[PDB]
Ligand binder design. Structure first.
Ligand SMILES: CC(=O)N[C@H]1[C@H](O[C@@H]2[C@H](O)[C@@H](O)[C@H](O)O[C@@H]2CO)O[C@H](CO)[C@H](O)[C@@H]1O[C@@H]1O[C@H](CO)[C@H](O)[C@H](O[C@]2(C(=O)O)C[C@H](O)[C@@H](NC(C)=O)[C@H]([C@H](O)[C@H](O)CO)O2)[C@H]1O
Ligand SMILES: CC(=O)N[C@H]1[C@H](O[C@@H]2[C@H](O)[C@@H](O)[C@H](O)O[C@@H]2CO)O[C@H](CO)[C@H](O)[C@@H]1O[C@@H]1O[C@H](CO)[C@H](O)[C@H](O[C@]2(C(=O)O)C[C@H](O)[C@@H](NC(C)=O)[C@H]([C@H](O)[C@H](O)CO)O2)[C@H]1O
Ligand SMILES: CC(=O)N[C@H]1[C@H](O[C@@H]2[C@H](O)[C@@H](O)[C@H](O)O[C@@H]2CO)O[C@H](CO)[C@H](O)[C@@H]1O[C@@H]1O[C@H](CO)[C@H](O)[C@H](O[C@]2(C(=O)O)C[C@H](O)[C@@H](NC(C)=O)[C@H]([C@H](O)[C@H](O)CO)O2)[C@H]1O
Ligand SMILES: CC(=O)N[C@H]1[C@H](O[C@@H]2[C@H](O)[C@@H](O)[C@H](O)O[C@@H]2CO)O[C@H](CO)[C@H](O)[C@@H]1O[C@@H]1O[C@H](CO)[C@H](O)[C@H](O[C@]2(C(=O)O)C[C@H](O)[C@@H](NC(C)=O)[C@H]([C@H](O)[C@H](O)CO)O2)[C@H]1O
Ligand SMILES: CC(=O)N[C@H]1[C@H](O[C@@H]2[C@H](O)[C@@H](O)[C@H](O)O[C@@H]2CO)O[C@H](CO)[C@H](O)[C@@H]1O[C@@H]1O[C@H](CO)[C@H](O)[C@H](O[C@]2(C(=O)O)C[C@H](O)[C@@H](NC(C)=O)[C@H]([C@H](O)[C@H](O)CO)O2)[C@H]1O
Lengths: 278, 281, 279, 278, 284
């Protein structure tokens, strides 16, 4: 699989596959009930704050995590491998943020009037396509943060030891692979630029508290995945890995300004071709 | 035909058609009377808010919906090889942003201490989408709140399609919740989004900018052409000579002097589409 | 001028002309006196507000209007010649003047009446057009009930001889005009008509809000090509060249009841034209 | 130098020259003393306001003016002229705006705490390179403004008459040339688009009062000065004119919100070549 | 070293080297203890303000400084007297600021957004941002320029204009004073509010910078592994590594966090990754 040779031609030598990845903002897909917690699906549960400089214990369901899927491609086997050539990707549903008729904190709080404040604030959009899991590099705001041990994969899960001060900057010890959906918090785990030779990733961040969310969408834009040498990600064991996170901001409730993260689903249409290798 | 062959040449092989789609912000075109509701045409009616976490029922006339039109093209159709109209390009323009420079009206004023200043111009969340295709725009439903009590008359919602109430998956991507944009002023834009899993025969282009007092921004020129050809050089092909135009152009809200009532503002969109005849098999 | 043929060659087959159009924000150029109203030239007079939901009567001098000029080109004439507008270099001049924050506007510290004189801010509108005939206009208003003056401005009612209808708040094809007079057509009413203007190129942008920072760029190195997809620029009917524009920078605000005055800036045009054979 | 002919080849036919222009925000370079006014060098003195609608008398040291320099090129004389082909220009010192530890108006005025508010507000960046002085067109906010007669060059300096109402728009009578450093106020004098055939200028303006200042800087960007015919500015009598202004905004003091303009220096590196002319 | 000739071909004629530079916002990497000050690593200590117009004495640990590293490349010339030599040439760099996602932590103990009830969210990092990186074949040349020539910077612990000149700053140091120059030859020592890339030098370095000001400005960052910055000049020549030394320099300030105690601000910085492609170049 090391030496990359000619493209393979002939029947079924090119394929397209599509997938959507639902966001993982904190509330899991179940319970489905719209009274017992399912009404928060697509959102986090209410963000809970530290009680002191030394007591920061966020709930698992308040922490957005990476979405990921591993897709199995047609069996193939000088061997052949599937090569990801390009991707059309789209974040769906920004129009739903035009709902300003709900029960959020209103724009006129004196009289409880105006409109229901739309989703605003910090936004984070990353997607990746690769032929193996996305390589992750840990880096946190606060190495003292007391993440739960169960239900979430954090730096301590990997090292078996408490975070160190270097984890607030770049600590090469704190690395992982995005091998599970809805488990790796995005406030901890970042694409690792020192690895990911077989993955392309693309991200942006906009911060603030009331920042207007911005999003574009079209079915006419293709992201090429080929590297400088004309070679796309090569799918080891015919596995294709898709990873993303799409945070639009928070809604704010009428009770103590409780914030809920809002995420939106991402569509992928990947074009792949067979490549000779040895 | 599924197989796309050569361009047709000769007399009348290329045509240009134009249309404007008026916005559908909530108030219908009629009554025309400027005292009986017609004064809100181009706008929504006053946005009504939920009364609790479990009671959110927006008025239909408070919900912007998609604009659409189906235009009939000239009839077409050895008779073993057929012809279809192919949409090559579109010049499209949102008209009327200058009208937002009216700051002399009776909106909430900028100085509420003296009730002075200027009439606050339209501001806030903005949403601009257009599409051109050879069949209706494919729609994917996704809502803020699956508990929202959308009206069961006068509007097409997820429940219209499924015959069942919305579920938690409708707040993310639920592949069951799909529709086609086959009616003007009927599909709310807060529910129905272009479906990237379909629309093989339509090109769509959209953007969203949120917030409450965000300055609206717009550009307009008659010098810009959008090419509609795909990677293979093939534009949307008009099934049964029908051309579908879809759009929505929300500029923000105006706010009244009475308990900050908000009204959505929309603007009309112009389309000039160039089509050519294409041989198909 | 139906069929467009070869370019004309030879002596004086290419020409260049320049003009500036001063803004039309509401105060006319006269009286010139700086105590009798001339001090507002380049600005509107104080924006006056509706007194009810059914009583909106703006003063003519509070409404920015389109600037326009028709320039006469050198006389030319089966096969005739027309002047063809090839490109334009255009610039909005004087943004540096907005750096005057030492005047008597509403100050930045209203608590103590201190700080600086608040600079021009808010809603901005920049459009220019170059064509071989008047700019085609499409009417569209915020409020079809607005009571524009009958004299002194050209409005929808001027054209139709009838009151505005609700369709005038969206696209009503009946409500059309031509930009044939300077300082007469309000920009909150009259927009470039995308369904016409085959022989004019226009370019516009809008940024709204109340305190939005104005933005402007300027350079003498930027050329706007006016040729269409077929390589044909606007053709000047009867050797007339039409220039149209509006350049609103925002408002200044006074210390008296937050009265707003629109601010506009002049626009420079330098048009390159060439002779074109036509049949 | 009427007709422009071929490029001159051979030894020393191409030259590079560099210069920095310090900003002229209102306080002159002297006195140097940091207690006698020198502490304001790089800044204006405190902006003074009109006392009524008819009494606007700005101090000279509150008005930013154009920076300019005339550089002498190697002597040359079918004659030859120096042709400016390109310029690399940069505004230096934006990092200094990261000083938020001084005694400006603080971010928390309720308690007088936080940080020293950094420079913010209206920004103005223009540079020009030409073979003769930059041509200026006058245009003011207020034709009634009572500028000082001595110490600044204003419209009245040129016309010998008071400003007229047309000076608030485009009045072709009100023209000048940028022939002195630190003398022509930028709120009065603008690049004249009806002239400047032998100069290239590039400008932008961003307004507001608390607007975040933005600046990019790199040594990898070249501005080509050649016109549509491949001809750059031709230096009359071997003189090269550099003109600029780089306003970053204002700092605000803790005393009645007094504002001081902040300017930054601009670097220029001009490439010139010999040109045959007739 | 001066005259640039053909590219060298053959085995190991092209190489790639990578490095990360951690931010230098004010708190040093040690002590490591999360109770003794290590909890501030990645941040400045609390910004302290002037007490009058003539008394501005910032603490060293409140001043972000330039990050830098010198990488030693494989030696090329056994004999420097040969009429033709080889040098490493930096062709391009992939660079990335890592960890912006960590700013999505709004669950800590910063000043909260609901100050009436002490609720809402922990206010995220906001405000003034500064991103510069450089790659060159010798130290980055620095030009001094300060807000206030009266600022009483410590004499020990930071390299300032006075460190270089041995004299107090002059009023000209508030604009361009060509006397006030230095080289970025040490990590975590040169304050970024004092020292700027010198556009009059740096012939053998490429630098790229941007500044965004304000106090509550939303921070913005992009990251991808698909973006290459080309380092070749107008003649097709990249930085040439003098004595095989490659210099990397950067600063990446994201803004401040604000505490619940007197709105004390702490600068936040993020690390920067570099992957530099270099090739051997014949020179004489
Ligand atoms: C219901 C509750 O209080 N849950 C606590 C939880 O308390 C458990 C148990 O449920 C409770 O009966 C018992 O008295 O105490 C035990 C143990 O303490 O304790 C956990 C910590 O272990 C949490 O503190 C939890 O509180 C929830 O925490 C979530 C974050 O993990 C989140 O903040 C919840 O906030 C929301 C929510 O997302 O559910 C915010 C939301 O806006 C609210 N919705 C509305 C319409 O107001 C809801 C709502 O108040 C509650 O869900 C109850 O209907 O809370 C927070 O409750
Ligand atoms: C007129 C009214 O009260 N309408 C109610 C409606 O009341 C019905 C019935 O129509 C009415 O004649 C009767 O008195 O009572 C019954 C039942 O109570 O009930 C419906 C059902 O939900 C609505 O509540 C309706 O209220 C209107 O709802 C609209 C949204 O669907 C919108 O919010 C209307 O608000 C506006 C408007 O857009 O018309 C907002 C606008 O800014 C206002 N304009 C001005 C100049 O003030 C108008 C204005 O108050 C009224 O239209 C004048 O009657 O209302 C809202 O009225
Ligand atoms: C002076 C006045 O109030 N004028 C009215 C006008 O009244 C006329 C006549 O002029 C007056 O002497 C008489 O008492 O009444 C008659 C008829 O009623 O009536 C018209 C309507 O037909 C207007 O209401 C007009 O008021 C002016 O309207 C302008 C817009 O059309 C504008 O708002 C004027 O406001 C300014 C101005 O732009 O001139 C705002 C400006 O900021 C002010 N300048 C300063 C330094 O304060 C001036 C200034 O107050 C006045 O011009 C007095 O010198 O007013 C508005 O006055
Ligand atoms: C010192 C003073 O009052 N200067 C006046 C000047 O007064 C002269 C003379 O100096 C004075 O002793 C005498 O009593 O009166 C005469 C003439 O009346 O008069 C001129 C007009 O001719 C000015 O009004 C001047 O005031 C200064 O004007 C500057 C603008 O030209 C500027 O606003 C000055 O404001 C600053 C400054 O820039 O120097 C603003 C600055 O933020 C302040 N610094 C601090 C740390 O507070 C300083 C400071 O207050 C003074 O410099 C005193 O050291 O003032 C303004 O003073
Ligand atoms: C602790 C203190 O006051 N330190 C002073 C320092 O005082 C030393 C000595 O530590 C102290 O015991 C004694 O009273 O006096 C000596 C000598 O005077 O004096 C220096 C000046 O020489 C400083 O004034 C220092 O104060 C610290 O200054 C830092 C900037 O250099 C910074 O502002 C510190 O502020 C923080 C911090 O960054 O550590 C801000 C931070 O948000 C705070 N964290 C929390 C959770 O509140 C901490 C915290 O209050 C202190 O570290 C104590 O735990 O302070 C500032 O303290």
């Amino acid at each position: 699989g090391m030496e990359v040779l000619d493209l393979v031609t002939g029947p079924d030598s090119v394929t397209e596959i599509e997938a959507f990845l639902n966001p993982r903002m904190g509330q899991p897909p179940t319970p489905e009930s719209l009274t017992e917690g399912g009404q928060y699906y697509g959102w986090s549960r209410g963000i809970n704050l530290a009680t002191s400089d030394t007591e920061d214990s966020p709930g698992n369901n308040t922490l957005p995590t990476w979405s990921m899927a591993k897709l199995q491609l047609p069996m193939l086997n000088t061997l052949q491998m599937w090569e990801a050539v390009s991707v059309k990707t789209e974040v769906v549903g920004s129009g739903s943020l035009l709902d300003v008729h709900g029960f959020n904190k209103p724009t006129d709080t004196v009289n409880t009037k105006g409109i229901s404040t739309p989703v605003e604030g910090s936004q984070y959009h990353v997607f990746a396509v690769g032929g193996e899991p996305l390589d992750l590099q840990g880096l946190v705001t606060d190495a003292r943060t007391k993440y739960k041990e169960e239900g979430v994969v954090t730096i301590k899960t990997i090292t078996k030891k408490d975070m160190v001060n270097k984890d607030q900057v770049l600590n090469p010890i704190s690395k992982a692979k995005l091998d599970k959906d809805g488990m790796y918090p995005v406030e901890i785990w970042h694409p690792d630029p020192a690895k990911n030779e077989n993955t392309r990733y693309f991200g942006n961040y906009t911060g603030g508290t009331t920042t207007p969310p911005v999003l574009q969408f079209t079915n006419t834009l293709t992201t090429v995945l080929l590297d400088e040498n004309g070679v796309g990600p090569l799918c080891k064991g015919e596995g294709l890995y898709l990873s993303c996170v799409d945070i639009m901001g928070w809604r704010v409730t009428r009770n103590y300004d409780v914030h809920h993260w809002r995420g939106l689903p991402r569509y992928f249409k990947i074009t792949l071709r067979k490549r000779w290798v040895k």
